Design an enzyme around this catalytic site. Structure first.
Site, PDB file in Angstrom:
ATOM      1  N   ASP A 121      37.294  78.257  74.781  1.00 40.34           N
ATOM      2  CA  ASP A 121      37.736  78.201  73.409  1.00 40.34           C
ATOM      3  C   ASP A 121      36.656  78.736  72.469  1.00 40.34           C
ATOM      4  OD1 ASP A 121      38.954  77.583  70.973  1.00 40.34           O
ATOM      5  OD2 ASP A 121      40.014  75.894  71.858  1.00 40.34           O
ATOM      6  N   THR A 159      43.893  78.166  68.182  1.00 36.99           N
ATOM      7  CA  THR A 159      43.939  77.732  69.579  1.00 36.99           C
ATOM      8  C   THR A 159      45.343  77.674  70.192  1.00 36.99           C
ATOM      9  OG1 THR A 159      41.867  76.569  69.302  1.00 36.99           O
ATOM     10  CG2 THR A 159      43.183  76.000  71.237  1.00 36.99           C
ATOM     11  N   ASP A 261      33.870  76.630  71.038  1.00 39.02           N
ATOM     12  CA  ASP A 261      34.565  76.438  69.762  1.00 39.02           C
ATOM     13  C   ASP A 261      34.084  75.185  69.017  1.00 39.02           C
ATOM     14  OD1 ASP A 261      36.891  77.389  67.894  1.00 39.02           O
ATOM     15  OD2 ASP A 261      37.360  75.294  68.245  1.00 39.02           O
ATOM     16  N   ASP A 683      64.368  97.361  58.850  1.00 35.82           N
ATOM     17  CA  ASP A 683      64.188  96.024  59.391  1.00 35.82           C
ATOM     18  C   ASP A 683      64.353  94.982  58.275  1.00 35.82           C
ATOM     19  OD1 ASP A 683      63.763  94.062  61.279  1.00 35.82           O
ATOM     20  OD2 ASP A 683      61.580  94.249  61.252  1.00 35.82           O
ATOM     21  N   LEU A 689      62.619  94.487  65.031  1.00 39.60           N
ATOM     22  CA  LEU A 689      63.510  95.329  65.831  1.00 39.60           C
ATOM     23  C   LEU A 689      64.383  96.161  64.919  1.00 39.60           C
ATOM     24  CD1 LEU A 689      64.734  92.570  68.332  1.00 39.60           C
ATOM     25  CD2 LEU A 689      62.714  94.031  68.567  1.00 39.60           C
TER      26      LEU A 689
HETATM   27  C1  LIG Z   1      59.303  90.005  71.983  1.00 42.42           C
HETATM   28  O1  LIG Z   1      59.924  89.591  73.201  1.00 42.42           O
HETATM   29  C2  LIG Z   1      60.984  88.651  73.082  1.00 42.42           C
HETATM   30  C3  LIG Z   1      61.520  88.246  74.463  1.00 42.42           C
HETATM   31  O2  LIG Z   1      62.066  89.371  75.119  1.00 42.42           O
HETATM   32  C4  LIG Z   1      62.099  89.189  72.179  1.00 42.42           C
HETATM   33  O3  LIG Z   1      62.916  88.107  71.835  1.00 42.42           O
HETATM   34  C5  LIG Z   1      64.245  88.167  72.363  1.00 42.42           C
HETATM   35  O4  LIG Z   1      65.064  88.976  71.537  1.00 42.42           O
HETATM   36  C6  LIG Z   1      66.490  88.856  71.593  1.00 42.42           C
HETATM   37  C7  LIG Z   1      67.090  89.511  70.339  1.00 42.42           C
HETATM   38  O5  LIG Z   1      66.684  88.823  69.160  1.00 42.42           O
HETATM   39  C8  LIG Z   1      67.029  87.420  71.739  1.00 42.42           C
HETATM   40  O6  LIG Z   1      68.349  87.528  72.246  1.00 42.42           O
HETATM   41  C9  LIG Z   1      69.295  86.582  71.705  1.00 42.42           C
HETATM   42  O7  LIG Z   1      69.394  85.472  72.575  1.00 42.42           O
HETATM   43  C10 LIG Z   1      70.353  84.479  72.261  1.00 42.42           C
HETATM   44  C11 LIG Z   1      70.204  83.356  73.289  1.00 42.42           C
HETATM   45  O8  LIG Z   1      68.852  82.957  73.255  1.00 42.42           O
HETATM   46  C12 LIG Z   1      68.611  81.723  73.956  1.00 42.42           C
HETATM   47  O9  LIG Z   1      68.272  81.903  75.326  1.00 42.42           O
HETATM   48  C13 LIG Z   1      67.074  82.649  75.538  1.00 42.42           C
HETATM   49  C14 LIG Z   1      66.918  83.047  77.015  1.00 42.42           C
HETATM   50  O10 LIG Z   1      66.733  81.949  77.886  1.00 42.42           O
HETATM   51  C15 LIG Z   1      65.883  81.884  74.925  1.00 42.42           C
HETATM   52  O11 LIG Z   1      64.678  82.591  75.091  1.00 42.42           O
HETATM   53  C16 LIG Z   1      66.117  81.634  73.429  1.00 42.42           C
HETATM   54  O12 LIG Z   1      65.036  80.879  72.889  1.00 42.42           O
HETATM   55  C17 LIG Z   1      64.932  80.971  71.440  1.00 42.42           C
HETATM   56  O13 LIG Z   1      65.548  79.887  70.751  1.00 42.42           O
HETATM   57  C18 LIG Z   1      64.977  78.606  71.014  1.00 42.42           C
HETATM   58  C19 LIG Z   1      65.781  77.552  70.266  1.00 42.42           C
HETATM   59  O14 LIG Z   1      67.073  77.501  70.831  1.00 42.42           O
HETATM   60  C20 LIG Z   1      63.489  78.558  70.637  1.00 42.42           C
HETATM   61  O15 LIG Z   1      62.901  77.354  71.086  1.00 42.42           O
HETATM   62  C21 LIG Z   1      62.730  79.762  71.214  1.00 42.42           C
HETATM   63  O16 LIG Z   1      61.425  79.810  70.662  1.00 42.42           O
HETATM   64  C22 LIG Z   1      63.481  81.075  70.952  1.00 42.42           C
HETATM   65  O17 LIG Z   1      63.502  81.297  69.552  1.00 42.42           O
HETATM   66  C23 LIG Z   1      63.087  82.616  69.142  1.00 42.42           C
HETATM   67  O18 LIG Z   1      64.115  83.592  69.290  1.00 42.42           O
HETATM   68  C24 LIG Z   1      65.265  83.408  68.471  1.00 42.42           C
HETATM   69  C25 LIG Z   1      66.331  84.450  68.829  1.00 42.42           C
HETATM   70  O19 LIG Z   1      67.101  83.993  69.923  1.00 42.42           O
HETATM   71  C26 LIG Z   1      64.851  83.453  66.993  1.00 42.42           C
HETATM   72  O20 LIG Z   1      65.954  83.222  66.146  1.00 42.42           O
HETATM   73  C27 LIG Z   1      63.771  82.405  66.720  1.00 42.42           C
HETATM   74  O21 LIG Z   1      63.303  82.520  65.399  1.00 42.42           O
HETATM   75  C28 LIG Z   1      62.593  82.535  67.689  1.00 42.42           C
HETATM   76  O22 LIG Z   1      61.818  83.663  67.337  1.00 42.42           O
HETATM   77  C29 LIG Z   1      67.496  80.979  73.212  1.00 42.42           C
HETATM   78  O23 LIG Z   1      67.472  79.629  73.620  1.00 42.42           O
HETATM   79  C30 LIG Z   1      71.757  85.090  72.248  1.00 42.42           C
HETATM   80  O24 LIG Z   1      72.717  84.134  71.841  1.00 42.42           O
HETATM   81  C31 LIG Z   1      71.795  86.299  71.308  1.00 42.42           C
HETATM   82  O25 LIG Z   1      73.054  86.939  71.411  1.00 42.42           O
HETATM   83  C32 LIG Z   1      70.646  87.287  71.579  1.00 42.42           C
HETATM   84  O26 LIG Z   1      70.880  88.035  72.757  1.00 42.42           O
HETATM   85  C33 LIG Z   1      66.169  86.575  72.681  1.00 42.42           C
HETATM   86  O27 LIG Z   1      66.521  85.221  72.556  1.00 42.42           O
HETATM   87  C34 LIG Z   1      64.685  86.703  72.368  1.00 42.42           C
HETATM   88  N1  LIG Z   1      63.870  85.897  73.281  1.00 42.42           N
HETATM   89  C35 LIG Z   1      62.895  85.049  72.891  1.00 42.42           C
HETATM   90  C36 LIG Z   1      62.172  84.308  73.978  1.00 42.42           C
HETATM   91  O28 LIG Z   1      62.551  84.833  71.721  1.00 42.42           O
HETATM   92  C37 LIG Z   1      61.539  89.730  70.863  1.00 42.42           C
HETATM   93  O29 LIG Z   1      62.580  90.369  70.154  1.00 42.42           O
HETATM   94  C38 LIG Z   1      60.339  90.657  71.073  1.00 42.42           C
HETATM   95  N2  LIG Z   1      59.723  91.021  69.810  1.00 42.42           N
HETATM   96  C39 LIG Z   1      59.415  92.290  69.505  1.00 42.42           C
HETATM   97  C40 LIG Z   1      58.779  92.535  68.167  1.00 42.42           C
HETATM   98  O30 LIG Z   1      59.635  93.246  70.261  1.00 42.42           O
HETATM   99  O1  YGB Z   2      43.296  70.583  71.235  1.00 45.43           O
HETATM  100  C1  YGB Z   2      42.623  71.239  72.025  1.00 45.43           C
HETATM  101  N1  YGB Z   2      41.429  71.928  71.578  1.00 45.43           N
HETATM  102  C2  YGB Z   2      41.054  71.829  70.172  1.00 45.43           C
HETATM  103  C3  YGB Z   2      39.569  72.075  70.053  1.00 45.43           C
HETATM  104  C4  YGB Z   2      38.557  71.303  70.658  1.00 45.43           C
HETATM  105  N2  YGB Z   2      37.383  71.847  70.316  1.00 45.43           N
HETATM  106  N3  YGB Z   2      37.626  72.935  69.509  1.00 45.43           N
HETATM  107  N4  YGB Z   2      39.001  73.060  69.366  1.00 45.43           N
HETATM  108  C5  YGB Z   2      43.051  71.310  73.478  1.00 45.43           C
HETATM  109  C6  YGB Z   2      43.694  72.676  73.937  1.00 45.43           C
HETATM  110  C7  YGB Z   2      44.897  72.250  75.031  1.00 45.43           C
HETATM  111  C8  YGB Z   2      45.411  72.866  76.385  1.00 45.43           C
HETATM  112  N5  YGB Z   2      44.567  72.083  77.511  1.00 45.43           N
HETATM  113  C9  YGB Z   2      44.285  73.021  78.569  1.00 45.43           C
HETATM  114  O2  YGB Z   2      43.423  72.652  79.366  1.00 45.43           O
HETATM  115  O3  YGB Z   2      44.521  74.389  78.392  1.00 45.43           O
HETATM  116  C10 YGB Z   2      44.561  75.285  79.456  1.00 45.43           C
HETATM  117  C11 YGB Z   2      45.447  76.415  79.103  1.00 45.43           C
HETATM  118  C12 YGB Z   2      45.095  77.659  79.405  1.00 45.43           C
HETATM  119  C13 YGB Z   2      45.950  78.716  79.060  1.00 45.43           C
HETATM  120 CL1  YGB Z   2      45.518  80.343  79.439  1.00 45.43          CL
HETATM  121  C14 YGB Z   2      47.159  78.486  78.408  1.00 45.43           C
HETATM  122  C15 YGB Z   2      47.508  77.227  78.101  1.00 45.43           C
HETATM  123 CL2  YGB Z   2      49.002  76.940  77.295  1.00 45.43          CL
HETATM  124  C16 YGB Z   2      46.691  76.174  78.427  1.00 45.43           C
HETATM  125  C17 YGB Z   2      44.039  70.756  76.840  1.00 45.43           C
HETATM  126  C18 YGB Z   2      44.639  70.763  75.365  1.00 45.43           C
HETATM  127  C19 YGB Z   2      44.145  70.133  74.000  1.00 45.43           C
HETATM  128 CA    CA Z   3      65.575  93.973  62.562  1.00 48.29          CA
HETATM  129 ZN    ZN Z   4      40.660  77.822  70.101  1.00 50.47          ZN
HETATM  130 ZN    ZN Z   5      38.323  75.961  66.547  1.00 47.84          ZN
END
Ligand SMILES: *[C@@H]1O[C@H](CO)[C@@H](O[C@@H]2O[C@H](CO)[C@@H](O[C@@H]3O[C@H](CO[C@H]4O[C@H](CO)[C@@H](O)[C@H](O[C@H]5O[C@H](CO)[C@@H](O)[C@H](O)[C@@H]5O[C@H]5O[C@H](CO)[C@@H](O)[C@H](O)[C@@H]5O)[C@@H]4O)[C@@H](O)[C@H](O)[C@@H]3O)[C@H](O)[C@H]2NC(C)=O)[C@H](O)[C@H]1NC(C)=O
Ligand code: YGB
Ligand code: CA
Ligand code: ZN
Ligand code: ZN
Ligand code: CL
Ligand code: CL
Length: 806
Positions: A121, A159, A261, A683, A689
């Site tokens: 970190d 982080t 960190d 956009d 996109l």
């Molecule tokens: C970077 O890369 C990612 C991954 O490829 C791209 O994101 C994908 O883009 C498309 C188009 O917008 C989305 O497709 C839609 O999907 C829904 C169904 O989506 C559900 O199922 C998927 C697959 O398992 C899942 O990943 C989705 O998860 C989203 O929603 C959750 C809450 O229900 C949330 O916890 C999670 O963080 C995620 O949210 C994010 O994406 C949504 C858009 O779905 C957005 O509104 C939100 O703000 C977040 O950013 C979800 O359960 C269909 O119904 C639609 O028809 C459509 O096909 C993908 O879902 C999306 N995938 C992910 C993981 O975000 C990015 O576009 C790309 N970015 C760039 C700049 O290139």
């Molecule tokens: O709050 C925190 N730090 C705050 C701080 C302290 N001192 N300065 N700042 C910690 C960072 C978290 C993740 N974890 C863990 O061991 O992480 C391994 C890991 C590696 C990758 Cl590659 C990806 C993921 Cl998601 C997790 C212990 C957690 C609580």
């Molecule tokens: Ca767009």
């Molecule tokens: Zn950090």
């Molecule tokens: Zn820090």
């Protein structure tokens, strides 16, 4: 409640998660308050320390010891890491000369080289050079393995967003962890570093590496370590897990250090107190590498040494207060610090106007150490808009500074000398990457890259198929000795039309005038050739971009430029042209100031018209290929074709004109010619996109002419600048931008002065990867080159940051 009556007898650091009301013996149990009554006693031994002494050699196995120096410890898989060194006269890993690992040297039963992620970190990129004398183990990894001079984190440079991006290959806007602190308006809940809320599954989107692994039959060590598990126990647990039977043993592991960190915050990035945290990290690295040498795994395991972000000099006296800008300060919530996110304190109050907030925060003090943005106007390279947890109002804070709401928030809520969270291109925020092992290359430096790319590589290192993410798979193939993945160009979806002369002047009613009737077999067959593409290998140097979606478009050839003209959006999707070092700038002659000419190759119905711009008092127009750079007074008439025309706010024309008239020429001198591809971006919903036809939110008044949110340009030349752009034999050099198309220049506090004081600076802020432009246009560039596709993918991910030396 948890009936924590059961025992951890022999269950210490078990891999499967047993559910309530039973007690757990896994390293997560302390965070859920659900450990078995004896966990500390049995699973967290400390007695005798962590190192073997000369008197412990061949001792009697006492199970109360933290680690063992007995004869059976190798077999039990629980020796102290220096055991073989003190007792068997073996040397430390750091002391051996590094020999290339040409092939994996793995013990029988090991189906694949394991992956250990060693995350540190706040490990600032320049620690590698500046602390090299006190980090010999890390320095061995660096110089014998594969390293970058630095690795670029994601914004905000914090982080949680960065660790989860490492684990998923996604932008924070996509994985949902947009800060260490967040408020979700739908949940009506707050996510913090402290508290239990962060433990609900609903915050964490995407698919992290350990889920990718599990779902494809590869087992993972945990990626979450309790704060009260000391670092020595973390290493030993990793080494115990490596001693498990074949069908029980994980293939991927993680280690995490809170240092440097933690100290960086207290002492600043280079405080004299920072030498010891760096020593400690190294020691830990030594322990792992000694441990692996014992288990004969040190030429088998791939180790990634990686940081989440860097560290900057920040102190309390460098705080800007919103109370010094706003009167109604008590009607807002601010997420404070090295970034600012503002929202209304209540939604029951609709008198809240973000417009007045932005206005009150804009260029109000000559020294201002932050800049307000609507999130949709943040530089596209930050990809920090498309999530409901990101407040509409964002403040980008200057490096070395903080923003706060009121003075009371800072003295009653100086104890710190370091912080992080700034814009991810800031030098002090850059962090580290080293790869060491059989699958990585020997003594190899690679160019800096973004941390969004590692998920793909870690999937490759583990024979896993990556979940969809934001890396560009193949862009980091040059890191690896042997590749799982062969990238291939996407297929073109829409083929172009190649229209000939099909329409007469009098068929057009566009309201466009031009003085062009000032009129030889030689120079009439010559300009036919131009309209056929006789000079295409001059202005289109890397082949036509591929349209990756279904649409209707024409290729238009000209003496000085070539364009892909959209019949749907009524403008080019791209415009390509080369300016050699030799080429000269000329002006728009007085009789041609308002010249717009109909294009006899495209129908009236699929053209823009001058009438709409005349009726639209907010909207003017510009040109994608610039008249200023015509090769002849005869060729200049081409630049004024209705098909080279694009809608532009008069405020934006100021930026565009200076780019076209001054900067292109300057770039051509410095780089020995440049090839330029420019175009519009739509956009409106800020998801990064391309928007479809039925998603356009802004037209030129009383027309079907859509209004771009942004304008891009891709500027390519030869990496070896001794060669002209149009005759380059080797690697390419590129820089790009995506300029917001805005009705004002409020973003530039000096915009009232000459363009030569502020334009280039704005362009720099909105620097971009080609890949960002690809997402935004649905185009695919560099289709026809002499370069390998892997190299072209690296080129496409490159970002010109305009920061000085690290
Ligand atoms: C970077 O890369 C990612 C991954 O490829 C791209 O994101 C994908 O883009 C498309 C188009 O917008 C989305 O497709 C839609 O999907 C829904 C169904 O989506 C559900 O199922 C998927 C697959 O398992 C899942 O990943 C989705 O998860 C989203 O929603 C959750 C809450 O229900 C949330 O916890 C999670 O963080 C995620 O949210 C994010 O994406 C949504 C858009 O779905 C957005 O509104 C939100 O703000 C977040 O950013 C979800 O359960 C269909 O119904 C639609 O028809 C459509 O096909 C993908 O879902 C999306 N995938 C992910 C993981 O975000 C990015 O576009 C790309 N970015 C760039 C700049 O290139
Ligand atoms: O709050 C925190 N730090 C705050 C701080 C302290 N001192 N300065 N700042 C910690 C960072 C978290 C993740 N974890 C863990 O061991 O992480 C391994 C890991 C590696 C990758 Cl590659 C990806 C993921 Cl998601 C997790 C212990 C957690 C609580
Ligand atoms: Ca767009
Ligand atoms: Zn950090
Ligand atoms: Zn820090
Ligand atoms: Cl935050
Ligand atoms: Cl202006």
């Amino acid at each position: 409640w948890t009936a924590t009556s059961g025992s951890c007898k022999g269950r210490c650091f078990e891999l499967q998660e047993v559910g309530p009301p039973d007690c757990r013996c896994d390293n997560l149990c302390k965070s859920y308050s659900s450990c078995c009554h004896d966990f500390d006693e049995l699973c967290l031994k400390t007695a005798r320390g962590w190192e073997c002494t000369k008197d412990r050699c061949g001792e009697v196995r006492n199970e109360e010891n933290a680690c063992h120096c007995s004869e059976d410890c190798l077999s039990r898989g629980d020796c102290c890491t220096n055991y073989q060194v003190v007792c068997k006269g073996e040397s430390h890993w750091v002391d051996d000369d590094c020999e290339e690992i040409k092939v994996p040297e793995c013990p029988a039963g090991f189906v694949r080289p394991p992956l250990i992620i060693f995350s540190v970190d706040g490990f600032r990129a320049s620690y590698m050079k500046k602390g090299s004398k006190v980090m010999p183990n890390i320095e061995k990894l660096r110089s014998c393995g594969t390293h970058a001079p630095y690795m670029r984190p994601v914004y905000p440079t914090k982080t949680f967003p960065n660790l989860y991006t490492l684990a998923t290959g996604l932008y924070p806007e996509s994985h949902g962890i947009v800060g260490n602190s967040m408020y979700d308006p739908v949940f009506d809940a707050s996510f913090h570093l402290r508290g239990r809320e962060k433990f609900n599954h609903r915050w964490w989107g995407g698919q992290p590496l350990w889920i990718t692994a599990t779902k494809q039959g590869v087992r993972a060590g945990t990626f979450f370590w309790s704060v009260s598990i000391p670092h020595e126990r973390r290493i030993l647990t990793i080494l115990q897990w490596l001693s498990l039977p074949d069908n029980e043993r994980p293939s991927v592991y993680a280690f995490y250090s809170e240092q440097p960190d933690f100290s960086g915050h207290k002492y600043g990035p280079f405080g004299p107190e920072m030498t010891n945290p760096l020593r400690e990290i190294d020691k830990t690295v030594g322990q792992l590498m000694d441990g692996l040498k014992q288990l004969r795994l040190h030429r088998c395991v791939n180790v990634i040494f990686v940081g989440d972000h860097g560290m900057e000099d920040v102190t309390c006296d460098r705080t800007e207060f919103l109370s010094n800008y706003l009167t109604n300060v008590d009607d807002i919530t601010l997420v404070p610090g090295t970034l600012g996110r503002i929202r209304a304190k209540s939604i029951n109050n609709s008198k809240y106007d973000p417009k007045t907030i932005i206005a009150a925060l804009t260029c109000k003090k000559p020294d201002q150490h932050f800049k307000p943005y609507m999130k949709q106007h943040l530089p596209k390279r930050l990809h920090y808009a498309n999530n409901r947890r990101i407040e509409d109002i964002h403040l980008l804070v200057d490096r070395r500074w903080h923003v706060a709401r009121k003075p009371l928030d800072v003295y009653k809520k100086c104890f710190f000398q370091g912080d992080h969270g700034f814009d991810n291109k800031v030098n002090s925020m850059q962090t580290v990457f080293v790869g060491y092992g059989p699958t990585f290359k020997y003594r190899t430096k690679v160019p800096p890259f973004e941390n969004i790319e590692l998920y793909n590589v870690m999937c490759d290192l583990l024979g896993l198929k990556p979940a969809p993410n934001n890396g560009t798979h193949g862009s980091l193939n040059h890191l690896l000795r042997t590749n799982t993945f062969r990238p291939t160009m996407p297929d073109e979806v829409s083929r172009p039309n190649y229209p000939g002369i099909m329409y007469l002047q009098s068929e057009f009613d566009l309201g466009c005038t031009c003085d062009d009737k000032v009129e030889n077999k030689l120079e009439e067959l010559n300009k036919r050739l131009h309209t056929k593409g006789s000079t295409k290998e001059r202005h289109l140097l890397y082949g036509r971009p591929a349209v990756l979606y279904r649409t209707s478009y024409d290729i238009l050839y000209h003496t000085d430029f070539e364009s892909g003209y959209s019949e749907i959006f009524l403008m080019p999707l791209w415009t390509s042209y080369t300016i050699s070092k030799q080429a000269e700038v000329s002006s728009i002659p007085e009789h041609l100031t308002n010249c717009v000419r109909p294009d006899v190759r495209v129908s009236p119905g699929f053209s823009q018209n001058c009438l709409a711009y005349k009726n639209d008092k907010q909207m003017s127009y510009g040109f994608l290929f610039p008249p200023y750079l015509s090769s002849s007074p005869e060729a200049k008439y081409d630049a004024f074709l209705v098909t080279n025309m694009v809608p532009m706010y008069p405020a934006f024309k100021r930026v565009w004109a200076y780019f076209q008239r001054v900067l292109v020429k300057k770039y051509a001198s410095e780089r020995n010619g440049v090839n330029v591809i420019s175009g519009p971006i739509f956009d409106y919903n800020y998801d990064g996109l391309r928007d479809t036809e039925d998603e356009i939110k802004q037209y030129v008044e009383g027309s079907s002419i859509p209004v771009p949110t942004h304008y891009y340009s891709i500027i390519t030349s030869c990496l070896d600048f001794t060669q002209p752009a149009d005759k380059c034999d080797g690697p390419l050099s590129v820089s790009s931008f995506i300029l917001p198309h805005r009705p004002d220049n409020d973003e530039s506090c000096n915009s009232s002065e000459d363009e030569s004081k502020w334009v280039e600076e704005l362009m720099k802020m909105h620097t971009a990867r080609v890949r960002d432009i690809e997402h935004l246009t649905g185009l695919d560039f560099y289709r026809k080159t002499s370069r390998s596709y892997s190299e072209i993918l690296t080129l496409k991910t490159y970002l010109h940051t305009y920061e000085s030396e690290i």
